[PDB]
Amino acid sequence: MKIADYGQLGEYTCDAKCDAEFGEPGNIRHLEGKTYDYRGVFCFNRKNLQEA
Amino acid sequence: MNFNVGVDFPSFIAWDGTTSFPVKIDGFNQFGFTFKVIEELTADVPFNIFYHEASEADPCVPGPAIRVPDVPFCDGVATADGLATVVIPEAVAVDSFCAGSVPCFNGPWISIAPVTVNADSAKVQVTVTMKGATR
């Protein structure tokens, strides 16, 4: 998950009143990735490989 | 301390630049060539590898030359005609040497000679070395 941005929330308000108002929302997104592979081959001769 | 290496690893000329010499490998169980360049080359020089067999007239004299066959390894592909060859590249310096050997024995005599006898061939020398002896 990737956080695109936080919103702007809250405010300084006078203490004399009893209500509060809405802010605005943020954005959060979802991401994916994949994996690659490395490959190869090699050969030998049994007699030489064993008797070296 | 210095050793008498010639006792165990004798060396025989094979191509002195004007003539070839059959080399008897029957008494030994490994061998290999050695190439040296005495002058700057003008073009690639290929070499041919032959082997002989004991003559009928004399059991200690080589017969005619039979060209060595190829032997593909586990990787790579066979030659176009399935016969061994050696190529000395253009970049060989005068102060360096090369080495190479055949995978299979075949007859008891071996030889090497250039495909074409030209001024470029006269600038090369080939020698053969032996491993431990059997007699």
Binding site: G33, K34, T35, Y36, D37, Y38, R39, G40, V41, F42, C43, F44, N45, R46, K47, L49 | C74
Partner: protein
């Protein structure tokens, strides 16, 4: 500020297996491979300099 600009991910270490499809009693063939990947993180945590 790497460790946040770019990430590196690995999945499994190298493995070696013998191949019976071409392994005679007088020869062998080996197979190997591995996997990994990577993905850029924050784009704002790095800069590049160039000539002009």
């Amino acid at each position: 500020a790497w460790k946040t600009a770019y990430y590196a991910v690995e999945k499994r270490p190298m493995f070696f297996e013998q191949y019976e499809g071409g392994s005679s009693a007088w020869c062998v063939k080996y197979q190997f491979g591995a996997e990994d990947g990577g993905f850029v993180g924050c784009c704002e945590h790095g800069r590049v300099l160039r000539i002009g």
